[PDB]
Amino acid sequence: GPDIIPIVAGVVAGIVLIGLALLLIWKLLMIIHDRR
């Protein structure tokens, strides 16, 4: 869209960081119940 690119660069970027940050901490959750 018009005058929306600047917004996407910020949001679309953070979206990739959230999906990666969750998968990281995710391993910290399973690593505990892995030995349980």
Side-chain angles (χ1 to χ4, degrees), residues 3-12:
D3 191 77
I4 188 172
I5 306 173
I7 295 78
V8 182
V11 184
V12 88

Side-chain angles (χ1 to χ4, degrees), residues 19-36:
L20 187 149
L22 182 66
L23 171 147
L24 179 63
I25 185 65
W26 174 62
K27 190 67 178 62
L28 282 301
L29 202 290
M30 293 294 184
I31 189 66
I32 312 294
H33 305 282
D34 181 270
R35 304 175 183 158
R36 182 72 289 162

